[PDB]
Design an enzyme around this catalytic site. Structure first.
Site, short mmCIF file in Angstrom:
data_model
loop_
_atom_site.label_atom_id
_atom_site.label_comp_id
_atom_site.label_asym_id
_atom_site.label_seq_id
_atom_site.Cartn_x
_atom_site.Cartn_y
_atom_site.Cartn_z
N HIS A 10 0.85 -1.23 0.00
CA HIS A 10 0.00 0.00 0.00
C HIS A 10 0.87 1.26 0.00
O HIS A 10 0.37 2.34 -0.21
CB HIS A 10 -0.91 0.00 1.23
N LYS A 31 -1.08 -7.53 -12.25
CA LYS A 31 -2.58 -7.49 -12.20
C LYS A 31 -3.08 -6.51 -13.26
O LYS A 31 -2.70 -6.57 -14.41
CB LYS A 31 -3.04 -7.02 -10.82
N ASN A 34 -3.76 -0.88 -9.48
CA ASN A 34 -2.95 -0.87 -8.22
C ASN A 34 -2.93 0.53 -7.62
O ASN A 34 -2.99 1.52 -8.32
CB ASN A 34 -1.52 -1.30 -8.54
N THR A 35 -2.84 0.62 -6.32
CA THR A 35 -2.81 1.96 -5.66
C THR A 35 -1.80 1.92 -4.51
O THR A 35 -1.56 0.89 -3.91
CB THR A 35 -4.20 2.29 -5.11
N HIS A 97 -4.87 -1.03 7.50
CA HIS A 97 -6.02 -1.25 6.57
C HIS A 97 -6.23 -0.01 5.68
O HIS A 97 -6.09 1.11 6.11
CB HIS A 97 -7.30 -1.52 7.38
#
Length: 105
Positions: A10, A31, A34-35, A97
């Site tokens: 992240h 993939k 994405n971030t 999170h």
């Protein structure tokens, strides 16, 4: 799931990450989207200090985060970043999170 990985996937070390590898590396497998967040560790674990256990927090202004976007080719992405507040959950004092982009839903 853990300030560590949460700091590896992240988060990154530049506003213009190398999405090509930030996704084609090994923990992603090329993939499509994405971030990540552009911030220094101290400022990250610091924005969680004094906080309580697991709770929903949110930046007090904005944050520049890099973002990968695959819309063409098979394993290629575009670079797109912007500054905006982001909701995230932190424990006694460790962010792990990523709620979402902008203020909470």
């Amino acid at each position: 799931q853990d300030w560590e990985t949460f700091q590896k996937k992240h988060l990154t070390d530049t506003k213009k990450v190398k999405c090509d590898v930030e996704m084609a590396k090994a923990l992603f497998d090329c993939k499509k989207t994405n971030t990540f967040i552009y911030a220094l560790p101290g400022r990250v674990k610091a924005l969680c200090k004094n906080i309580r256990d697991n709770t929903d927090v949110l930046s007090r202004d904005a944050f520049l985060l890099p973002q990968c976007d695959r819309i063409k080719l098979p394993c290629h992405y575009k670079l797109s970043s912007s500054t905006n507040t982001i909701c995230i959950t932190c424990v006694n004092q460790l962010p792990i999170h990523f709620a979402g982009v902008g203020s909470c839903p």
